Amino acid sequence: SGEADCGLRPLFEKKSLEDKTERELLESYIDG
Amino acid sequence: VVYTDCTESGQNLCLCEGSNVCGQGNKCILGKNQCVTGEGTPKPQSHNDGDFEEIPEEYLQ
Amino acid sequence: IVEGSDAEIGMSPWQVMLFRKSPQELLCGASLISDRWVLTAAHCLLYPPWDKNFTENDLLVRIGKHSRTRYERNIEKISMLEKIYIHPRYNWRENLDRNIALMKLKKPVAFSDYIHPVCLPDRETAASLLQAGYKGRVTGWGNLKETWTANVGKGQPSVLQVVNLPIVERPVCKDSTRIRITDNMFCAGYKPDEGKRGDACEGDSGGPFVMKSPFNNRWYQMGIVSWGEGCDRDGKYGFYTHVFRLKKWIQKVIDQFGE
Ligand SMILES: *[C@@H]1O[C@H](CO)[C@@H](O)[C@H](O)[C@H]1NC(C)=O
Ligand code: NA
Known part of the structure; x- marks a missing residue:
């Protein structure tokens, strides 16, 4: 709800590249 | 703070009775182990070493 | 870990290393939340039972690090502290309640591929x-x-x-x-x-x-x-x-x- 470019990694989100284990975190929001 | 096992009797701020911290105003006595009242002494800060490459000496001033 | x-x-790239001047030790981790502010735990800076009460001049923050021990030249930035702030109701005698602290850097740090809040x-x-x-x-x-x-x-x-x-x-x-x-x-x-x-x-x-x-x-x-x-x-x-x-x-x- 504020404004400055935080939490978007230059070598990952900014390049549309996924890190090795972030899927594990995302999946945890949905179970399985 | 990561509490680790007591290594000497009279220690505190360490894990005494199983995985339980023995807090201040208590001290560990090593048996089964028991943590009881009585001014204890903090287990010395679990010390690190010095294998770091030197940083520019202007920062160590 | x-x-x-x-x-x-x-x-x-927000990971910060709290580094002790002499002797040279890893003190603690920390994180970058802006170009001048770093967030950490209070017991990193103030823990009396271990005789720990650091002032601004005893520590460095190292930002953009990957290797633990290397001086990663032209990748990491090393900043001095301007002022340390401990939560005023941080409780160390009992249970580490409100274990929180901020550090203000003397200068703003420049963001890079390796350094970002x-x-x-x-x-x-x-x-x-x-x-x-x-x-x-x-x-x-x-x-x-x-x-x-x-x-x-x-x-x-x-x-x-x-x-x-x-x-x-x-x-x-x-x-x-x-x-x-x-x-x-x-x-x-x-x-x-x-x-x-x-x-x-x-x-x-x-x-x-x-x-x-x-x-x-x-x-x-x-x-x-x-x-x-x-x-x-x-x-x-x-x-x-x-x-x-x-x-x-x-x-x-x-x-x-x-x-
Ligand atoms: C530690 O140092 C601070 C800041 O200089 C000082 O005000 C305070 O009295 C000291 N605190 C303790 C618990 O020794
Ligand atoms: Na566990």
Whole structure:
């Protein structure tokens, strides 16, 4: 709800590249 | 703070009775182990070493 | 970090190293929340029972690091502290209540591929993401085991470590310890019989427990590595300062003093 470019990694989100284990975190929001 | 096992009797701020911290105003006595009242002494800060490459000496001033 | 893996380069570019001047030691982890402000645990800076009461001139922050021991020239930045701020109701005698601290840098640090700030949560983010069973990420250069056999085992990692841990129910947290758990603490880690393992350990304190929102793709710091009874013991859990719970203090410190 504020404004400055935080939490978007230059070598990952900014390049549309996924890190090795972030899927594990995302999946945890949905179970399985 | 990561509490680790007591290594000497009279220690505190360490894990005494199983995985339980023995807090201040208590001290560990090593048996089964028991943590009881009585001014204890903090287990010395679990010390690190010095294998770091030197940083520019202007920062160590 | 116990049972983690080597971070990829730039994987956690908000990760900060608190570095002691003389002797040269890793003190703690920490995180970058703006170009002049770094968030850490209070016991990193103030812990009387160990005779710890650092002033600004005793420490450095090192930002953009990957290797633990290397001076990573033209990658890391090394900043001096302007002022340290400990939460005024941080309680060290009893239970590490309100274990939170901020450091203001003398100069702003320039952002790069390796150095970039994490977000702090608003209310909707805290409410959504901070729920039991959801996983966050912990990073640090702390110990790889609680104890190892001296001069033989690997003790400190050569490179920043990363581990993913599930947030644990508040009643299970409280039943795993005799310490009074408060509002501004949460706990994380696998249960025995979940098979998987992992924990923060010595030297990881002050570092960030972060979570990625699936809806805006941003990483939020939800916790600070705060305290543990051992590392990775079955039926024990890592405790973390609940950053959102204490954000009003961060606000007070930052627009009275800095930004
Ligand atoms: C530690 O140093 C601070 C800041 O200089 C000082 O005000 C305070 O009295 C000291 N605190 C303790 C607990 O010794
Ligand atoms: Na555990």
